[PDB]
Symmetry: D3
Subunit: 252 residues, 6 copies
């Protein structure tokens, strides 16, 4: 299948699996990705997602260039470009090798944490090839890179390498290709060593008020945070601190 | 007293002084901090604030874990988390050693300029210990660090060191611990070598429209800037330039 | 003339030409700059602008310190400070040598791409000399530099050098002064090797929703992007990809 | 089990009837009723045979007086008010048929409807301040958006009621009728909504409300997915065909 | 060439008259008419002799029924509605004089005016949902801002019309007159606008509308360039002089 | 010294009376009066015995005609309008009692109130454009938020007045009474406000107005500190006790 989806303990692996097309996303892959995000959001055993891709040449080069009765945003909904935005409420680590361009770059930018192989190259080549539609593949770059660096990518369509991405904090870690799966899994293990409902709430709060004035943010009541107060994990955090031991999270 | 507050010339020193609890903020310290911010805002002899902390182990590890008739946001109001937001209108330099975590990190992030000892470590361990409430301690990190680095802190609860903070421009300067007080004072001296009402106005304008579209910002009338036109310092800036001499500011 | 304006192929050169006043912008230069931006926006042969300045000492030190019947924002409108904001819809490269301060820094920050000579120094000395009016020269720095670095500039009025600007991604490239014109032209050549109407649309979309929540951005319909669908260049991009050849853009 | 009929839900043709049915408590919403309402809104949103909803209530004394004086957060009205828990949006057009007392959370609930028909016995109010209760975001925000500023404040701050005629005068309600005519009047409205193209009605509702508190220029430059999707529907083609052949369209909701 | 008179444009003193003049299509706006309207708004905005605009329409049956059932995007009404293309703002105060049917894009166009005078034959509506059409941002956003919430939704969702008296009742229209009196009533309004200081009127309009969907605190701290520029005008001085000498000001529009 | 009585301020029980008292200038607000008003609002906000304010004015001709034709910026009305200087918010509920001319900055000031009772002599307007004055953010923003769009524009752009009956019709005013009954009518309103739980009233006002120009979804997810603080008050307990014992609550404002 062109998307490989597996649940291993509390980690869901969503893996692009069409290396013969440099993992360009077909309409069928978008269907399978949408099924994955739905399951990821609905299943309380899934605490984190690793988004990855098969092969060495490319994580993802964007959409595969007819024709659908429903609007589907690129990445099974996840980009919100071309259709309704789907939000993945679990923390996500993207493991990126090789080319990560256009819609593929946008997709990686939907992740929370990004670990790149030292072969990774990021870019937005749409202007350079003369394509632009919908809202543009430009809004995440403006929020995740320094202003003039984002504009450089968006307007020239030239790529930047893993080291430069790391330098600006677009990516959290750069490793040799051989170490990419293990590195991604170390990050998922860190995310799942924290209280998973608290991690989810923190993500929802951070991102849900990111483009608002700070004062508006600070006065926001976020439902996942409200609901955390009634959880077993919340009680487990107090018990464990009171008994000077490590908490054991259950995800409820 | 657990907060030490002193006015020396045109600098107010607000110093956390409970090193035996790694400067965790008690309800009493929050009262004393609120008194400090009130005096800082109301006294025209105070042109800048240095926020610092006693001991080597930690600037501040957040709130000390009953129970109050009024809502008090952490840091005598300054964070706006847990109660009404108090804004310090004078420019503030935070001098941070050792651990700076949770609410302590948020508090440092309320400062304008941050100077860190090379022992400083910044983090938001709330998710990792299973605590989250109110709006979350997440909104300043999203505004003061690159997107994926902020998310790394918020979601894994792991710390970053002074050198990495400096690298991203979270901190303005890193010095040896022995040099921290003097470095903080150099920054307060720079702030007070500029026209102090103009500095205050600039801070109010920059921050008062920070999460708005640029066009909205550029069309804003800010009362401190309007009021600057009628000051003696404003006339002193023109006189001094006209007579090719250094201006002598009076703060009126 | 104190602004030198030339069209060479698809690049417009807008050059400040009053080196005897360190390119401080007079009311007459503001008139000439406004004429330039009007022509730049209206002429479909102009695909990119290089904003530059004569002499080695300074790109621009801001406004020249009576008195006009109309409000004119600094830089022929381009800053939107002191009058209506004029938007340059073509991609702009600023080539900055020497001092780039106050209104001159703000003006450079209106460009998309900034190439600096290794002599460049950026700063906002208004607070330090005791001047502040209108909305303040503070809003672009908050959007183009890390929060605490922006505040350092705004509040102390001290300069940063080309290497530090590059480090944070305020500037895209630093070169020796002798290489500045050629470097700026390499960037204009990259911008014009991409489809120029698509570049313009991408710029309008990125910047038109920059201070909005991401969800608002992603749901925006941008007229330049809508209009791109009906262009000859848009068809030329498909033809060229279909025939495995380089596209030849015509700007229509 | 004893509560399982405190919300009456029935689908008749293309209209869903969601009826509050605990008149003994003046239709104050219990936790059980919030569960049933959440089931109703889920079904209303998911079922493409449902083109409009009539929200109504049993008895003559009251449409709804609010919450009845849980470990999951549930906003009042099975999610619909968004007060006390996540906001649930009903994407189908809704007519509220209101008799007697419509107060507090009950009034907020009626205000979630698109069209409101009131019996001439209806009295609307927000008594929370007057009885000394206030929590969450306050039951104040819809009033500020659906009445003139000073009238909204009067309700919010005094906690006194207004009558049906005054509500109609300010265009808080669309029609006032005798209590005997209320069900039938609500059904006339639902028939009007369902005589229009139902997916277009939905898309218009999503657009109108989705940009309501934004600047007009932002609203005008919004792309709304239900509008984009409408271009690919059978009803969109049927509209053109019917106009081209000077006949009444026959909508199929697809 | 055959369309060149489908918009009648004339300047009389300080009033520009922009008159839709294709009554045979019930003043549905063709592509040619959109071109002529865009020319009109350009001239209206650029010419300092024009202090106010009356937007009107020929015939008794209809002010405008919308778009007539191109490679540049043109918003309906020569840009003025901002629906289908870039928004064109008319900076001069505008009076719409509306008779008969004022529906769809036609109603949206009237809503772009500042003052609306209606003949007692006027009927306002948004029939798009009812005929099964919806595109772009929807013709819904101005209704939500110019009518009470539930009345706006009634129009938007049912596609049924309201009459002049009901429009006047909610303050959608400023005056209702007999059809014979419509031109003259519109001119009384334009005379009132032009008896005030015209650059101040413009600046007030730009301020009011430029911050309309923002929080009040944001609005109050806005600097509006037309207001800043007004301080340097002759009319500003003439206002002070006239008040100082207890006489009527004579405005020159400079 | 000669101005020290141009604002009359008195506290009677839980009502503060802030009365403009320079009828010889038709209660145009001088710089001295702005100082006294700022003192009043400071006391009103700080004193927990004050639960409501009645803002009124001496004489029959005019409530207030605006600013009287300084090195600190002072917004008109001791800060209250936020026009010309920092905005001062009165956190206690306010009733404005308006007679005669209520124009310009005077009208803006009345619009800062929550409830407005007008004598049948009241005339409201914004004559700034008509006399050729406009500065700062414009005296236009509250009108756009408190009247129907086209009625607000009519006032703003023509500078002509409307009468009390028309203001009441659109719900700009809450009640119209004969001039002889004005003080007593204003006091009935203040009694209604103070019969509700005063800290809850305050908190409702802060919530309603604090999110008024934001999208509804933003409003609904707002945490308001006066609401959070209300949970810890004696009045909150007294409300529960009184409801539990089927008796009238006795509020203490703590």
């Amino acid at each position: 299948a062109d998307i490989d989806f597996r649940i291993e303990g509390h980690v869901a692996h969503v893996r692009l699996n069409r290396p013969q097309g440099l993992n360009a996303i077909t309409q069928e892959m978008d269907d399978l990705l949408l099924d994955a995000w739905t399951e990821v959001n609905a299943n309380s055993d899934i605490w984190a997602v690793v988004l990855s891709a098969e092969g060495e040449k490319a994580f993802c080069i964007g959409a595969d260039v007819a024709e659908r009765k429903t609007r589907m945003a690129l990445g099974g909904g996840l980009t919100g470009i071309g259709g309704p935005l789907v939000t993945c409420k679990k923390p996500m680590v993207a493991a990126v090798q090789g080319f990560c361009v256009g819609g593929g770059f946008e997709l990686a930018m939907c992740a929370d944490i990004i670990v790149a192989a030292d072969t990774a190259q990021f870019g937005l080549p749409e202007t350079k090839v003369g394509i632009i539609g919908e809202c543009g593949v430009v809004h995440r770059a403006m929020r995740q890179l320094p202003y003039h660096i984002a504009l450089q990518l968006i307007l020239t369509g030239e790529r930047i390498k893993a080291d430069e991405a790391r330098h600006y904090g677009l990516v959290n870690e750069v490793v040799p290709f051989a170490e990419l799966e293990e590195a991604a899994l170390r990050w998922a293990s860190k995310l799942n060593a924290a209280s998973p409902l608290a991690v989810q709430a923190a993500k929802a709060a951070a991102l849900g008020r990111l483009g608002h004035p700070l004062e508006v943010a600070l006065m926001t009541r976020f439902e996942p945070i409200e609901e955390y107060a009634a959880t077993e994990d919340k009680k487990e955090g107090e018990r464990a601190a009171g008994e000077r031991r490590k908490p054991v999270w259950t995800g409820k």
